[PDB]
Amino acid sequence: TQKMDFDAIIIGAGFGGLYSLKKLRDDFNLKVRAFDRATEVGGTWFWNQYPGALSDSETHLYCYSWDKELLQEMEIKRKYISQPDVLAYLKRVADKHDLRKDIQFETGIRSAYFDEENSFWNVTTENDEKFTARFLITALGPLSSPNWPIIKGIETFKGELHHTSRWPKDVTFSGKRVGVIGTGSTGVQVITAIASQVKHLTVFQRSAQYSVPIGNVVMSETDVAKIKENYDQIWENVWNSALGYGLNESTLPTMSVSAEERDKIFEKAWQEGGGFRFMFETFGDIAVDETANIEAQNFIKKKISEIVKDPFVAKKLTPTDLYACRPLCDSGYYEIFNRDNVSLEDVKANPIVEIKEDCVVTADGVEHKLDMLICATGFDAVDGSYKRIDIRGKDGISIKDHWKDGPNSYLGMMVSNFPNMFMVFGPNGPLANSPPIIETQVRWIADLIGYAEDHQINQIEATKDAVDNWTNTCSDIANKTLFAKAKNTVYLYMGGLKEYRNQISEVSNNNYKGCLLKQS
């Protein structure tokens, strides 16, 4: 009966898809084919090429760890790695391991239907090409379709209108009046990078957020060669940590030291740089205790009032949140608002009501004349990338229907009613550095598929109770955190990378409890 085109089909050629291809094809000798709409590997690092695109984690850790030779060969130019260098790195990964011969570029996957009779997947591209594979590996990433601001007359603007997710080449800023909507991580990076290049910059800020310096500096040859000399212990620290950012994750309570010592600890992380460092290397209860969280707020607020000299602009930049989850990272964001060519518009108190052929109009009637409008307004949720595909498992239920109230899964990798489908960097996963999470899930999925090939089972599916057990574990951990109060279905597992690896290890050791292994 079953002919089958491949043993596994992968959707995505980013960090998750490239390692899924390497592990399944070369270490388990399976017949694999990967698909991506992009013309080249990279994932978000191919799509997102906006000004100032920079990694949150340091260069020596935002990479693969499974190729020891690649680690020694790796270019560590600056403390953090820019978008063109991440793209070049992932291209080198594809070059060394001969990955492109099994990737079909310029090809979008329209639908994936599970055949309960033969226990494989019917995958159809957007160009009506049909492939069959026993297993479906979905490496879609954490971000979905670009989120545009719903503003009356947005289609009327005659100037340049760019979304940061679709940043075109050859964009020039000199002599232009530019506006930026959005002050998230992407907006902060764009604003800091282009303020000195434009004639005038207007920042349309709906919600001011906390941001700490990133401290991106050049890495000397002694800085680099010494990292590669201790790379084995560095990665052992990652697997033994909660975030995988190479931090000395603190257990010290914030209010257990004096105000003078508390200031020294915050200042030390402020000088070194890093958003996760300021939160989790300083003290161990910043995300848990309200009094601790407020202390971290007041340090950044004090830094804002000192950097921007106009106290009324500093007031507009100061977040009104009672509690603060994650701060952003910047390379001179607050210094930008001291410039003569930068205007900050509080769009919560003075909302945008309309934009015309040459301007953005706020509620006060002021027409902000612009030659270019940049929308750094974010994306849809992680489950959007899945609901954007026509995925149907048992009985024909679509992932649109099964996740109509939000995403749920088992260990962040398996979905009930969708057998032989394994998610890489999917929802309900851990909150940590992405490459360590991706590597952890790809190795776990590959070991289960190899365990399947030897024990002659052809269908793997997580039970409904195992998924609901995972939702309880995530909610039990998250409700101990202030992350629930500030900005049912639980989107993230918050136990850390080490405890997440403990969770999935107990499953693989206990004969994959919660999963249903059908023999043939």
Ligand SMILES: Cc1cc2nc3c(=O)[nH]c(=O)nc-3n(C[C@H](O)[C@H](O)[C@H](O)COP(=O)(O)OP(=O)(O)OC[C@H]3O[C@@H](n4cnc5c(N)ncnc54)[C@H](O)[C@@H]3O)c2cc1C
């Ligand atoms: C500028 C920037 C900096 C970041 N820095 C960090 C950091 O320091 N630390 C960290 O942990 N995380 C960071 N992230 C987030 C995260 O690490 C990245 O998204 C990471 O590359 C994960 O990639 P991925 O391979 O899981 O998915 P992606 O890189 O998003 O790859 C998804 C791919 O799947 C393809 N695809 C989706 N649907 C279909 C379909 N139906 N058919 C065909 N193809 C499809 C898409 O074309 C896309 O290329 C950052 C993100 C950005 C944008």
Ligand SMILES: NC(=O)C1=CN([C@@H]2O[C@H](COP(=O)(O)OP(=O)(O)OC[C@H]3O[C@@H](n4cnc5c(N)ncnc54)[C@H](O)[C@@H]3O)[C@@H](O)[C@H]2O)C=CC1
């Ligand atoms: N350095 C890094 O590691 C990076 C990380 N990321 C991640 O990717 C995700 C995407 O983040 P971003 O692209 O920054 O988007 P975001 O969702 O973080 O920010 C969107 C911004 O646009 C504003 N906005 C949205 N709709 C609006 C409207 N109608 N009117 C006015 N303002 C509006 C919001 O106030 C918000 O500040 C983030 O969660 C982030 O963690 C993204 C880029 C870089």
